[PDB]
Amino acid sequence: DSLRPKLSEEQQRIIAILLDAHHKTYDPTYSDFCQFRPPVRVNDGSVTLELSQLSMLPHLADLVSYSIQKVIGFAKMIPGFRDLTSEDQIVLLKSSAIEVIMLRSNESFTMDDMSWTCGNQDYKYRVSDVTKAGHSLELIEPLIKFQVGLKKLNLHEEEHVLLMAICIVSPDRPGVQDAALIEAIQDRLSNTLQTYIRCRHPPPGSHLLYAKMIQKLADLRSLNEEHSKQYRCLSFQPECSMKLTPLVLEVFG
């Protein structure tokens, strides 16, 4: 069959809304970064020192916090999201925030040097900057892998924003009350994505890109799980909370 239906009027609207939501919640110039607590890079080419200093934690905690604020904004503009009870909106936001952050951060990730460049160089983040924030290689290295695997999908922005949307509106998050509603909205988003890929993505000699995109959603669950383990450890460090933000405290704590 290899049927390739045209995007409906509704699907076109969903895409345009999502593109626009993303353009309003993602600054590709990174002009707000001067407002974050400054990056501090103490020398160490050591878990003990990293935990003792947490020199990068205030800057990256502010980075992530600001990003959670943006994701919330993004989430609210997803068609259907506001049809959910505010209870379910919060469950979905809290459990997906780290995953969407990892997704959206791919826009700053570059394979030039395997860094997130929001730059200049003060605002370039590498493996070692993230260890200076108290995380370890068990999270960071798979995160870099995931970023690369994700660049090599060469997603259209349409596919990129749809993926984050699909990520947020997942029916099987623990503590969701109306799984059916959530699943209906997700299916509309997946159906749009599936339709978009078949229409607009060259060639196809086959439709594997959708499966590859859903695989990334599963990778993200692991990354989420691992971050959660490591955040818990972070929070065992005395005076750690002041280096975070209320939003970061509430979302992961």
Among the candidate windows 75-83, 97-105, 158-166, 197-205, which touches ligand TEY by CB under 6 A? Answer: 97-105
Pairing outcome for strands 109-110 and 115-117: antiparallel
**11, 105, 186, 192: which one binds ligand TEY (CB under 6 A):** 105
What's the CA gap between 155 and 19, in Å, rounded? Answer: 13
The least CB distance from residue 175 to ligand TEY, in Å, is: 21
Is 30 labeled as ligand-binding? Answer: no
Is residue 167 close enough to count as binding ligand TEY by CB under 6 A? no
**15, 130, 150, 189: which one binds ligand TEY (CB under 6 A):** 130
Helix H or strand E encompassing 164: helix 157-168
Q: What angle do CA 237, 221, 246 make, to 5 degrees?
A: 40
Among the candidate windows 3-11, 105-113, 173-181, 183-191, which touches ligand TEY by CB under 6 A? Answer: 105-113
Distance of CA 69 to the CA centre of its chain: 12
Say if residues 129 and 41 touch (Cβ distance below 8 Å): yes
Instruction: Find where tokens 């692991």 sit.
Output: 222
Q: For ligand TEY, which is the closer residue by CB, 132 or 198?
A: 132
Instruction: Name residue 117's beta-bridge partners.
Output: 124
3-state helix, strand, coil in the chain (%, to 5): 65, 5, 30
Is residue 74 close enough to count as binding ligand TEY by CB under 6 A? no
Is residue 101 close enough to count as binding ligand TEY by CB under 6 A? yes
Is 35 buried (19+), middle (13-18) or exposed (0-12) by CB count in 10 A?
A: exposed
- Give me the helices (H) in 31-84, please: 47-53, 57-76
The least CB distance from residue 32 to ligand TEY, in Å, is: 7
Is 135 labeled as ligand-binding? Answer: yes
Is residue 146 close enough to count as binding ligand TEY by CB under 6 A? no
Is 26 labeled as ligand-binding? Answer: yes
Is 17 buried (19+), middle (13-18) or exposed (0-12) by CB count in 10 A?
A: middle
**18, 78, 91, 102: which one binds ligand TEY (CB under 6 A):** 102
**118, 161, 165, 182: which one binds ligand TEY (CB under 6 A):** 118
Is residue 91 close enough to count as binding ligand TEY by CB under 6 A? no
Is 160 labeled as ligand-binding? Answer: no
Residues 212-231 that bind ligand TEY (CB under 6 A): 227, 231
Instruction: Name residue 115's beta-bridge partners.
Output: 110
Sign, Cα dihedral of 229, 235, 238, 243 = positive
Say if residues 58 and 241 touch (Cβ distance below 8 Å): no
Token representation of residue 123: 């605002």
Is 104 labeled as ligand-binding? Answer: yes
Is 59 labeled as ligand-binding? Answer: no
Residues forming contacts to ligand TEY in the complex (CB under 6 A) are 26-27, 30, 60-61, 63-64, 66-67, 70, 101-102, 104-105, 107-108, 116, 118, 125, 130, 133, 135, 139, 227, 231, 234, 248
**Binding site, annotated residues:** 26, 67, 104, 108, 135, 227
Binding residues for calcitriol, by number, are 26, 67, 104, 108, 135, 227
